[PDB]
Amino acid sequence: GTLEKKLDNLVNTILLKAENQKLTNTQEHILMLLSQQRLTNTDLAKALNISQAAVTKAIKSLVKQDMLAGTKDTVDARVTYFELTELAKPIASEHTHHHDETLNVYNRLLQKFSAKELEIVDKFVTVFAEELEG
Amino acid sequence: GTLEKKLDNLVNTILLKAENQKLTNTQEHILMLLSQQRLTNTDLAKALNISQAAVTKAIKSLVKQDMLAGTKDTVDARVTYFELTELAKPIASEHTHHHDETLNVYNRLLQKFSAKELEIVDKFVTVFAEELEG
Ligand SMILES: [Zn+2]
Ligand SMILES: [Zn+2]
Numbered sequence: 001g002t003l004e005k006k007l008d009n010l011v012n013t014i015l016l017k018a019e020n021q022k023l024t025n026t027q028e029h030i031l032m033l034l035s036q037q038r039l040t041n042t043d044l045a046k047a048l049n050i051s052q053a054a055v056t057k058a059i060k061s062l063v064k065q066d067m068l069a070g071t072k073d074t075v076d077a078r079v080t081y082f083e084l085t086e087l088a089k090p091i092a093s094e095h096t097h098h099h100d101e102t103l104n105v106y107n108r109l110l111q112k113f114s115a116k117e118l119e120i121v122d123k124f125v126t127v128f129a130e131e132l133e134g
Numbered sequence: 135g136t137l138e139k140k141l142d143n144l145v146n147t148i149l150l151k152a153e154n155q156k157l158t159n160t161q162e163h164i165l166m167l168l169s170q171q172r173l174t175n176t177d178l179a180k181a182l183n184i185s186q187a188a189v190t191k192a193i194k195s196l197v198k199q200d201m202l203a204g205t206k207d208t209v210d211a212r213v214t215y216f217e218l219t220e221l222a223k224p225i226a227s228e229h230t231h232h233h234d235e236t237l238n239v240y241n242r243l244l245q246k247f248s249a250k251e252l253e254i255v256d257k258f259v260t261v262f263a264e265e266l267e268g
Pocket of ligand 1: 025028029095099
């Protein structure tokens, strides 16, 4: 019962719960992002903290599945912007409020902690935040 | 910058980093578990905190991929035990020490916290632990 182990479990459940429980999470969160405005491959890599290449994989699958449509900027031809299609919009929404609920779960969970206890939680989830880069 | 949001991000990166970066994590951790001893479908569901059905999906894929072999108990015919095959063992090992490294990352990360700060961390990762059931 080192906290190290507790951490490794926590993450393991996060992965194994997602897995088991057709679109990737990447795909789901791309749709979610493009739900509130259109964006480049590059905004999206930035926003979601992933490779350009990973967006372009997901993007292409989405386009194959009629989810998404690329339409080029009329000042800079290099740039393409993606909109959702009608088929996607129900899907984006559904995922959007799946995420609204998980925030309540997070809120309720955090309520168990004094607001000074929480500054450690904040600190902790913050260093944990991007020690996940490697 | 509510901690709620910080949490939802943390998890999101955990999922999107795993995804992008052929075997599932379930599969990888089943192999990992069966690396140190043989076990039922049921030990494994318990151990990994997932449905019986999810183990049997993963198990069957593994058997199709020649990773795994079921051999029945000689006192209770109802019970099947799974061993890894030779093809699997390199794979289990590799994943085993991928996990050895992530523990150092976790350790190094936790070192930044006073040992009283850490009792909150422990508390926190513990309630977070299985508020992830729903
Ligand atoms: Zn999501
Ligand atoms: Zn793993």
